[PDB]
Design a protein around this ligand. Sequence first.
Ligand code: ANP
Ligand code: ANP
Ligand code: MG
Ligand code: MG
Ligand code: MG
Lengths: 289, 291
Amino acid sequence: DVVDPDIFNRDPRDHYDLLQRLGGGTYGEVFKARDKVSGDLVALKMVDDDVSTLQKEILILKTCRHANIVAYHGSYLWLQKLWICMEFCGAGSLQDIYQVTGSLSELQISYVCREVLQGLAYLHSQKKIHRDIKGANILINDAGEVRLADFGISAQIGAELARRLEFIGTPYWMAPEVAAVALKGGYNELCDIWSLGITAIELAELQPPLFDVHPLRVLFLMTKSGYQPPRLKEKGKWSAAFHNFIKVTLTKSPKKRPSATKMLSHQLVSQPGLNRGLILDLLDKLKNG
Amino acid sequence: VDPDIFNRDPRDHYDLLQRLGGGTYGEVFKARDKVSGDLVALKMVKMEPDDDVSTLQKEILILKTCRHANIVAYHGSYLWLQKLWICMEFCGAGSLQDIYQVTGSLSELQISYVCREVLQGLAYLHSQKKIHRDIKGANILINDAGEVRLADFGISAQIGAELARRLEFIGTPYWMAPEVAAVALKGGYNELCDIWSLGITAIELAELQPPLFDVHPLRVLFLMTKSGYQPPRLKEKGKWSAAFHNFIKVTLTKSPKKRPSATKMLSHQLVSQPGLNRGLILDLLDKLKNG
Ligand SMILES: Nc1ncnc2c1ncn2[C@@H]1O[C@H](COP(=O)(O)OP(=O)(O)NP(=O)(O)O)[C@@H](O)[C@H]1O
Ligand SMILES: Nc1ncnc2c1ncn2[C@@H]1O[C@H](COP(=O)(O)OP(=O)(O)NP(=O)(O)O)[C@@H](O)[C@H]1O
Ligand SMILES: [Mg+2]
Ligand SMILES: [Mg+2]
Ligand SMILES: [Mg+2]
């Protein structure tokens, strides 16, 4: 693969002024930027590995045109950096937000869950897996819209699915669980359903479950026999519908965990009363009081 | 790779004799130590430039840090003209596959002794948090004394190198589904895959073929993944005791959740039998040189 034809071979700063760092992890920064001619605001993401495999994130975002997935504007290849130009979501991520406003209301969490689920149903119908669903990767814009973002790890999934079936060993002596991994990989899209369940707890309690425990310990625990799916800490603050939502999304067995589409029929996210005003309230609270 | 690898021609230390095998990516030679006269096996591996060396490091290192009788012994390594040479213990009878392709199917007692010795090797490995991942008759070597040695940690090395490499870049785990977490730590299975392969190997030793060997490989992969695939059984019910039938049944437990560990299997009736010794394989080797 060579760099996608639609990518711009120029310096993004020829088109945009950089105003502020919006964050980004250890390896790449996201900038609030402004179009030098239009005056329109965008977000520029500046994303060893491989150029042709790193750009998979661009392809994913570019081929997504759904109201619950962050909108793609364009991409640049300049010197030692790949840039993604996307819609600027003014309130940033849900994590950015709740770190200021505190825990979300149940109705607000319900609304986020519904919108994430719609994004996930879209993605999964295209045989895409997000693989990194969490507060920090769900963005809110000024119109109170909920947008999935950060398809870096998703790009690793998509890259494997475009390629043929390659093997390590011989099947006849393989254990059935070795066979499954070798064939289908160790997981599928239903892993996003679990992550959403954890995200809902995160929005409710400002931390994912077991956050204070060493990561490697958590990883070892999750792989033990008899791992207990997480629950909401305070049982009284939340409705039975919410407890049930958490319960089924956090179904241990991938074969019995409900799909995004099935989850969209769950009572918690089909509540009459779920509306964008819930998010506009959050944005007001973020703004002032 | 190894920090004690010899960057020199192995032929400075050994005279090469016969070819003993080799899949598609190299060869194995019987060799003689020019100083001591002792006989070894030299496994040669081709190092092509798009093959990241991390795999080959892992293999030697797995072999280097194993001290157990039922694991083929490691002596040293040579890097010469982009060829990796692994010097190891010479097992003059070759592999169980090499042997049964001449002698024919093994007796139940002979299979029991092999299983015990492998389970001793596997128990040790899993106590080193290592997985062979390639247990099969071609990878079980027999020396002239009738003793059993696990070998060929090539696949183990590959999977191992991949995992250590991916571990570094797997981020925070708190939002991961257990199945995602399982993949992160270890490719989505555990050491109990070795017990399954041994069970298959016992059937292979009994019938000269693994189950479904007449079925196309990709189809077998497919069929095994499908919910409702039923574990194999020995073809003939009457050639084998109930202890053997149960050994197969219990090692070939589909769920990696209820499949017995190595050490648990060592207490199984079939391998805890008195009368299990290298004499049983010496019998097989006798059969190999006459009738
Ligand atoms: N389009 C956007 N509009 C507004 N804020 C954004 C936008 N994209 C990202 N951000 C913010 O900047 C962060 C960038 O994270 P992300 O897009 O996941 O890139 P990343 O390199 O993968 N960082 P990481 O979270 O470590 O994976 C997000 O968590 C938000 O806080
Ligand atoms: N130490 C040894 N002593 C005697 N014969 C050996 C020894 N090591 C290997 N052999 C023989 O040579 C073969 C070498 O193959 P092996 O080392 O198992 O894997 P490989 O051929 O290098 N790759 P693969 O195709 O996956 O088996 C064995 O099956 C034996 O027949
Ligand atoms: Mg992120
Ligand atoms: Mg990311
Ligand atoms: Mg082999």
